[PDB]
């Protein structure tokens, strides 16, 4: 589960302005915080889903709230994270046969088991964190 | 049905490790003696299945109690023979069957293409990083 | 779908806690803000998976986070909204086979037997107890 | 896993002899200490399988080596511990179905992927456990 921070700004007469730090040029807005985070959260999928389709390669690094917090350009913004999972992101996953090692398996059924996750789940972020 | 001979011996305040005479590579341990010998009982079985799994032969003559009790570097020891029944054992990884997101299934078959690499071992070591890196 | 806000703030040093609005009694923490929005999403998820296993009805109507940004006891909080899927859910506890001695099987059955317990609540009980020993 | 200390005695005009802290009454020997072990195994497994059959109730108090080394009674002892299983016991278990929440499911399969354990196996020595 990738989190990314967003910063939400609000004055009197205007709505909700968000900004994306990790991703400079994504700029959304709602009505009210709720609809700012969600549609920020359709732009953040939309952004990464149309590079995928361009066959871009995309590189999921996520800044944390705690390293932006006291930088000047968000002072005042209120700070929310926006969780992308990657079956968020492919609608049609293939399905392969592979072989694992059992000791690897142990460990990841251990982890897993806590976290409602699945070996598939588990392998593919392990897969594409291994890529950069 | 190998006997495998392990030793445990008290290291510092309650730590008490464990020797394996014939798998010398295994450092166990326990807060607890009983701790020790459970955790090194794990360490063997997970030794011995993982070798079988690549297909090596694992079938030698482990040593006894008797030709250690006395040597000078088991003074003191507590003993306990860990049986290993090798009869289940598979001799190849097991196989499974997962789901990938199509575009991550690319840049994997796409790198181990070049390395000439496994997408099985490729997942497997890339398993064994993101388990580390958590901690 | 079910939206729940929850609300991250900074209680001590290097600790986040969270507060759920829509439930109260979770409390849940994490030596940073995405491990606590990590382990809040998971207590929320068992918390509302359970129920729903026990045959409650939970769809009710989840808080805004509009609604509770500007009061004083969040001030300074960040927040995410945890989205929980009911579709899934079952309404009824998992159905296992289990082997066990017949010697343990029955001093179980015939425990139960008089307190008006079930195998099952019994065993459920009895594996939380075992599992209260962490290290 | 149940881990009975044993207490082995050696002298030369004689043969190895055994005690067993937690089943006074078991007194067992070998030409070599291998040999006196698994003949110790031997007489434990035999009692506690006895008295099931008897119809008695067994409660599994194991002594530990770390209290019991240091009494006169055992000075110059080389001690060694026994391990049975339940498994070891009943050759015949009956397979039942039952009902687990899911909560409690997920803990016991994180706790036994790392101990070559099982639900089954889990929950029978829960059962013994939490039966006092
Ligand atoms: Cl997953
Ligand atoms: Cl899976
Ligand atoms: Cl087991
Ligand atoms: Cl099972």
């Known amino acids: 589960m ?6 939400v700004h609000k004055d ?3 709505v909700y302005g ?4 990790d991703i400079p040029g994504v700029h959304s807005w709602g009505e009210t915080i709720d609809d700012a985070i969600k ?11 149309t590079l995928i389709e361009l ?9 944390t709230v705690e390293e932006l917090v006291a930088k000047p350009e968000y002072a005042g913004a209120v700070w929310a994270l926006v969780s992308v999972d990657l079956s968020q992101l ?12 059992r000791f690897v398996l142990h460990k ?14 588990f392998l593919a972020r392990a897969a594409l964190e291994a890529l950069n």
């Not at 492919?90 to 090692?101: F, L, Q, T």
């Not at 990841?108 to 789940?121: C, F, N, P």
Request: with cysteine.
């Open 90 to 101: 492919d609608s049609k996953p293939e399905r392969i046969n592979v072989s694992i090692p």
């Open 12 to 14: 009197d007469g205007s």
């Open 108 to 121: 990841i059924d251990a982890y897993v088991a806590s976290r409602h996750e699945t070996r598939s789940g």
């Open 2 to 7: 990738m989190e990314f921070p967003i910063a």
């Open 55 to 63: 066959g871009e390669d995309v590189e999921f690094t996520c800044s």
């Open 39 to 49: 549609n920020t959260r359709e732009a953040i999928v939309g952004h990464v889903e």
């Open 18 to 21: 968000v900004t994306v730090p």
